[PDB]
Write a protein that binds this DNA or RNA. Sequence first.
RNA 1: GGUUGCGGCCAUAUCUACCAGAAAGCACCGUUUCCCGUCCGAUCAACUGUAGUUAAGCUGGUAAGAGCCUGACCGAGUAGUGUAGUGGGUGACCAUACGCGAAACUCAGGUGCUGCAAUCU
RNA 2: GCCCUGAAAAUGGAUGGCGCUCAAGCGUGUUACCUAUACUCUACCGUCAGGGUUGAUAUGAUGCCCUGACGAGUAGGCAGG
RNA 3: AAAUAUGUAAGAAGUCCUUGUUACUUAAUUGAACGUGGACAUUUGAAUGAAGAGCUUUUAGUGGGCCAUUUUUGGUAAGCAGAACUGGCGAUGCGGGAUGAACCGAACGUAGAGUUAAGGUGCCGGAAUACACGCUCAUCAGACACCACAAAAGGUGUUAG
RNA 4: GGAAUACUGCCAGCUGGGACUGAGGACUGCGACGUAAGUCAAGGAUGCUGGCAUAAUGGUUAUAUGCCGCCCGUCUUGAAA
Lengths: 61, 60, 185, 172, 58, 159
Amino acid sequence: IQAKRDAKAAGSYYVEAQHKLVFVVRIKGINKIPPKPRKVLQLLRLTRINSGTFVKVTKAT
Amino acid sequence: IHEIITVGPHFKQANNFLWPFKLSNPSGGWGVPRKFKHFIQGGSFGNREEFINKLVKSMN
Amino acid sequence: GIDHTSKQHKRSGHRTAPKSDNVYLKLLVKLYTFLARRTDAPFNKVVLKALFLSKINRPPVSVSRIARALKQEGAANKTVVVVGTVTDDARIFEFPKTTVAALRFTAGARAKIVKAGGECITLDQLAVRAPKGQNTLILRGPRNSREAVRHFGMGPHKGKAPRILSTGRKFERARGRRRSKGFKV
Amino acid sequence: MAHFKEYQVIGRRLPTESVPEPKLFRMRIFASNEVIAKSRYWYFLQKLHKVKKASGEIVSINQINEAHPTKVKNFGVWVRYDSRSGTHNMYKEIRDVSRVAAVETLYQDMAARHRARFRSIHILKVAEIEKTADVKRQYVKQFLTKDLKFPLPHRVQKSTKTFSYKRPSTFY
Amino acid sequence: AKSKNHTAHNQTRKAHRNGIKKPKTYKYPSLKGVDPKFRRNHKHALHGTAKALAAAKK
Amino acid sequence: GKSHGYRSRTRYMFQRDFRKHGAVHLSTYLKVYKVGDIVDIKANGSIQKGMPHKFYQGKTGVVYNVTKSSVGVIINKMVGNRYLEKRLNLRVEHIKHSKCRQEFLERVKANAAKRAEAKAQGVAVQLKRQPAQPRESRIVSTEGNVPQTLAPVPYETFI
RNA sequence: GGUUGCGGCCAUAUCUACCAGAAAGCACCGUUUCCCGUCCGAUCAACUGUAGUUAAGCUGGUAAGAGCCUGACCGAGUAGUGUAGUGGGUGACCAUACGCGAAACUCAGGUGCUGCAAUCU
RNA sequence: GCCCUGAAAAUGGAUGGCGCUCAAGCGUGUUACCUAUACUCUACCGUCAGGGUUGAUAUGAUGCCCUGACGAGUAGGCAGG
RNA sequence: AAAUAUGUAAGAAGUCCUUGUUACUUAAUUGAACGUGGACAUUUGAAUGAAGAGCUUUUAGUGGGCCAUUUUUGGUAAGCAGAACUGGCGAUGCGGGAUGAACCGAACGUAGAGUUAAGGUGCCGGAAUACACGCUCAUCAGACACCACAAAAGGUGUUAG
RNA sequence: GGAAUACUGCCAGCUGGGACUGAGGACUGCGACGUAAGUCAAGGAUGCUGGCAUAAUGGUUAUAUGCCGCCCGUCUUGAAA
Ligand SMILES: [Mg+2]
Ligand SMILES: [Mg+2]
Ligand SMILES: [Mg+2]
Ligand SMILES: [Mg+2]
Ligand SMILES: [Mg+2]
Ligand SMILES: [Mg+2]
Ligand SMILES: [Mg+2]
Ligand SMILES: [Mg+2]
Ligand SMILES: [Mg+2]
Ligand SMILES: [Mg+2]
Ligand SMILES: [Mg+2]
Ligand SMILES: [Mg+2]
Ligand SMILES: [Mg+2]
Ligand SMILES: [Mg+2]
Ligand SMILES: [Mg+2]
Ligand SMILES: [Mg+2]
Ligand SMILES: [Mg+2]
Ligand SMILES: [Mg+2]
Ligand SMILES: [Mg+2]
Ligand SMILES: [Mg+2]
Ligand SMILES: [Mg+2]
Ligand SMILES: [Mg+2]
Ligand SMILES: [Mg+2]
Ligand SMILES: [Mg+2]
Ligand SMILES: [Mg+2]
Ligand SMILES: [Mg+2]
Ligand SMILES: [Mg+2]
Ligand SMILES: [Mg+2]
Ligand SMILES: [Mg+2]
Ligand SMILES: [Mg+2]
Ligand SMILES: [Mg+2]
Ligand SMILES: [Mg+2]
Ligand SMILES: [Mg+2]
Ligand SMILES: [Mg+2]
Ligand SMILES: [Mg+2]
Ligand SMILES: [Mg+2]
Ligand SMILES: [Mg+2]
Ligand SMILES: [Mg+2]
Ligand SMILES: [Mg+2]
Ligand SMILES: [Mg+2]
Ligand SMILES: [Mg+2]
Ligand SMILES: [Mg+2]
Ligand SMILES: [Mg+2]
Ligand SMILES: [Mg+2]
Ligand SMILES: [Mg+2]
Ligand SMILES: [Mg+2]
Ligand SMILES: [Mg+2]
Ligand SMILES: [Mg+2]
Ligand SMILES: [Mg+2]
Ligand SMILES: [Mg+2]
Ligand SMILES: [Mg+2]
Ligand SMILES: [Mg+2]
Ligand SMILES: [Mg+2]
C-alpha cells in the first residue's frame, strides 16, 4: 500500500509484482471437448464441472 | 494455507496433496446470460482476475 | 459426469487365493497369510503369493537344479524353498546334504535327497523352523521350457514353431520355408 | 460494457537494456470493470503503436471520477463506428451530468438508431461544450432556452392490484 | 452399388485406446546390421578383455 | 491410375536452396560420426546415392553404425498404434550433428563445474532449469517521461 | 601490413567503369635438344631465369554505380492464422475476445572475414 | 437504421397457440425470478481398491470389521444367481 | 514466407580421472569399440499429472456407416457425390430448440435438500404485464443461432449521420 | 481547508426467520471452558409433552385429477412409419 503512495508522492508509479498464484475452476462439462485442452484439463485435475485447483504461475503453466 | 498463498518451496507437493476442490454451483448465479464467452465479452471463462473470489465464494 | 482417465471398476489382475480346492492347500494358505500379515519378512509375502500360482507357473524344480544352486558362495547350508514339486534327476551323481521344503516330492526325489543324509520337510514344517524365513533359498523352475510356449509368436521371421500335428518333409517344409519354393518365411 | 466507469490507463513497452525507461502511454477508457479496461488499452495500443501485451506492461490503472458530478453539462461526442456496409465517423451531443452518464446513453443511442453493438464502436473524443451556442445539434439547443418549462401530458400511474374500483384518470 | 472408398476417421481413437507406448529400450541393444569386420574384431577384444580379468583373480 | 513411386510428392523437398546448387562443400565430408551420435536427417537431392526416403526427411535419430561413406541411423517410427524400430543407411551428405544435443553436453559440463565451485564452498547449488517466471514489482518514474496520452483514430479512405 | 601455396565459410567475395600499386612474390614473358601434346609449342610438355614489362592478370581506391549482405517502434501489429460465442449479416462476407504473426515497401549502414605454412622495406 | 415497393400456386393454418402496437415487436443495458438424470452435502444398493482381524477364547475366514472412489450402453465378453 | 500441425533432446544406461583388451584401424599404444579401478547422490539436472508400471496368451463382435464446425474436390446446384482434423449420431436416455437421430446444455445406481446450465418468466406454463434509453405503424408489420429462404433496384415514410 | 458518504474488499464481529437430514450404538480420538470439583455445542439426537383403538398409520387395488407415455420384433446411416 505505502509503496504505492510513495511512488505517487515522488511522481512515479509503483507497478505491482505479477501474480504468482491463480485458482482455476472448470465450468464446462465433460462432453464434446477437443483432445488437446481435454488433456490439459486432466493434468490440472479439473475433470468434473465446478471442481477447482490452485495453479502456480509460470510460463510453462 | 501459507505454503499456497506464498507459493514457495514445496508448493508443488503441498498443492498436489490437496485433492481438487468440489465446489457447488454458484449460489447467486453466474451473473451473466451465457457463460461460454469470455469475461471480457459478457461473462465467465478466461481470467477474471481478482473477481475470481466473489465467484468462488458463492460456489464455496 | 467425470472425464475418467482410468477404466472404472477394474480388478487387480491378480489371483487372490488358489483356484485349487485341496483343503490342505487352503490350510497351507491360511497359515502363510497369517505369517505374511503378522510379520515383516518379505519371504512369507512371497511364499503366500506363490501358493496361488497355477500349475503352469509352478514348473517343477529339479534335484540337479537344487544341487547347482548350492554351489553358490555362502549357500551350501541354506534351506531351499520350492513352493512347487521337486523331481528327480539321474544326471548328477555326487549330491549334497541339505534340507528341502517343497510342496511335493517325487519318489526318486525324496530318495536322492535322503540317501545323502538330507531332509524333506513340508512348508508348514519350514514355517516353524523359519518364522521369518531365515537361511532360505527360493528356487523357481523354467517356465519358458514349456512346449506350448514354443508356438507363441508364430509369424513371418519370428522363427517360432508351427503348430503342426505331425512332422516330416511333406509337412509345411516347402513354399514359404525356402528361397527355392517362392520365398522363405 | 454496461454501468460505465471511466479509467485512465497508463502503460509502456517492456524495458530493453538498450532502451531502459521506454515512453509511457495513456488512454481514457470507458469500461464497466478494470479487466475490460486494461484489455481495451491494449486493443487500441496495438492499432496505434507496434506493440502487443506480451511485449509490454500496464503501469497504472486509475478511475477518473467526474469533477462536478451534479452540474448539468452539454457534451460533444465524436465517434467512429462500423455499419453493415461501411465504417464512419460521427458527431453527436448529449446533455447529462457526467461523462460516465453520457457515454452510456451514447452507447445505447448507437444501438437504437444505427444498430451498433458496443464492439463496433470507437469513442474518439468526448468533451464539455463550454460556451452554449457552440451546441449545434438542435435536440440539445432545445433545452437551453430561458425559463424552460414543459408539462408531462397523459400520466399513467402504474397499479398495485389487478382490479380497480374506479376508472383511472391521466391528469398530472 | 457404390460404397464409401476410404477414411481415417476414428483411426487415431482406435490407436490410442491402449496404444502408442514408446519403443522398448535396452543397454546392450541389438547388433543387427553392424559392420561385420568390427563385430569379428569386437568378438576378440571381448574374449581377451574377459580372460585378462580372470587372470586378475588367480 | 494413382501413382505412389518412391520420390513422389518430393518436388520441393529435394530441391536445393536458391543460389545453393552445385558441389557440396567440403565441411560436410570432414565431420566425424561416432556411434551414439544424434544426427539430423535432411536429404540433398544432388547426392542421389544413400538417400533417405522422404519419410525421414526432417527426422532426428541415433547412429547405430559407421561405414566407409555412410552412417546407419536408428529411427523410431509409428505405424498403427506403436513405434517400430527403423534402421537407415544414409550417406553423410544427408546427415548432420544435432545441435540440441550439443546444448545438452555443454550444459552437463556447466553443471559439473557449478557443482564443484559449491562443494569447494560447501554451499548449495540449485541446478535444474527454472521456467520463465512472473515479474517482480517495479517503480517506473516520470522524470523525462510524462505519459503521452493517445486516442483512437477517425476513419479515412486513402485510395 | 604486402605476397605466395593449401584452404574454410562460398557475392559484405559477384558485375560495370575509371584510376592506383613501393618491395618481395605472382605474372606476362625468352627458348624447342630432350620426355611429351597439337591442324597450329596457341593450350599441353620440356628448357633458361637468361633478353624484356607492370601493359595485362592479380591487389587495392573511386562511383547519389547494377547486384548482394545487415538493420529498423519503415510499412504493419497490417496480411494470413490457432482457439470462442444461440456474435452482426438475406447472402457474399465482417466485427469482437484470448493468442501467434509475415511478405513486399521505405529508409539506414555495409562491400569479404579467416585458418595453416612460406616469404618481403 | 426501422418501415413501405420489388414479393405469383394449388384442402383451411400456423412467431408452437392465443394474442400483442410508449409491445408481449427491433437494437442495447441493469437486476430479480423459474428449471435437467448436471454440480454441492447426506442416507441406501452394488462394483472396485486399500487396510484391520480366528492370539487361548460357540453361531458364516470364500467370513466379520474400517476407509476412499466410481455407476450410460447396442453388437459382443466374462461373472453371480 | 507464416499460423496450426510435426522430429529430437532435458542425464546413474550419466559425467570425470586412471589405464586394460583386440585378429579392426592408425605413420604411431594412434584410434575405435567394450572393460578394470577411483571420484561425484539436498534441486541428480525444466513444468504438470500418475487414478500404479511392465508383460504374456487367447477369443467375440465388426469389416454397408452417417452427421456437425473448419479445411476442401467434382457439379448450376442438391436433404448431391467425394476426401482432411476433431467432435458427435450409430450404441444414449436426461434438460432446452413446440416438433425432430446429429444443434445447445449435460451423459444416467435408488433417493432427500440445496444450486445452476442451455433456455426461459403476458396467458396457455413453473418464473418481474420488471426497470432503462431509443427505434418502428405495415388496407402483406415484426418477433431469436442450427431452421425451415429471399435479391438487384426503388421510396418527399421516419430516425440519426 | 477539514469532513462526510458512495463503490469495493476484509473480520477466526454479534444476531432473527424458514427448510431437509439425525446415518452410528459401551469406552478408546482432537479439543474447549474452568482456580478447582467438574462442565461442554469437542470421533453422527436428545430431552419434555401429547395423540392412536371395530383406530392413527402403512401396503395393495379401483377410479378420478395434474403433468408425461406413438407398436413391438427386425434389417438399417435412419422405423411409430
Ligand atoms: Mg452454493
Ligand atoms: Mg441474494
Ligand atoms: Mg435463489
Ligand atoms: Mg455484469
Ligand atoms: Mg555366477
Ligand atoms: Mg525357459
Ligand atoms: Mg524340450
Ligand atoms: Mg374519474
Ligand atoms: Mg458393389
Ligand atoms: Mg451412397
Ligand atoms: Mg466399406
Ligand atoms: Mg472402388
Ligand atoms: Mg496422381
Ligand atoms: Mg506441395
Ligand atoms: Mg553453379
Ligand atoms: Mg544407381
Ligand atoms: Mg607444337
Ligand atoms: Mg610459349
Ligand atoms: Mg607449360
Ligand atoms: Mg596472370
Ligand atoms: Mg549499390
Ligand atoms: Mg460450442
Ligand atoms: Mg455465422
Ligand atoms: Mg437467417
Ligand atoms: Mg479475418
Ligand atoms: Mg404460384
Ligand atoms: Mg392452402
Ligand atoms: Mg434480424
Ligand atoms: Mg428488448
Ligand atoms: Mg436486452
Ligand atoms: Mg438423483
Ligand atoms: Mg452398466
Ligand atoms: Mg507431440
Ligand atoms: Mg511430476
Ligand atoms: Mg481379437
Ligand atoms: Mg478379429
Ligand atoms: Mg475379420
Ligand atoms: Mg450427443
Ligand atoms: Mg447398425
Ligand atoms: Mg445424447
Ligand atoms: Mg424452432
Ligand atoms: Mg394454448
Ligand atoms: Mg405463471
Ligand atoms: Mg400489460
Ligand atoms: Mg446469423
Ligand atoms: Mg430512408
Ligand atoms: Mg441412531
Ligand atoms: Mg390397524
Ligand atoms: Mg388402473
Ligand atoms: Mg403427450
Ligand atoms: Mg394422449
Ligand atoms: Mg434403406
Ligand atoms: Mg421398430
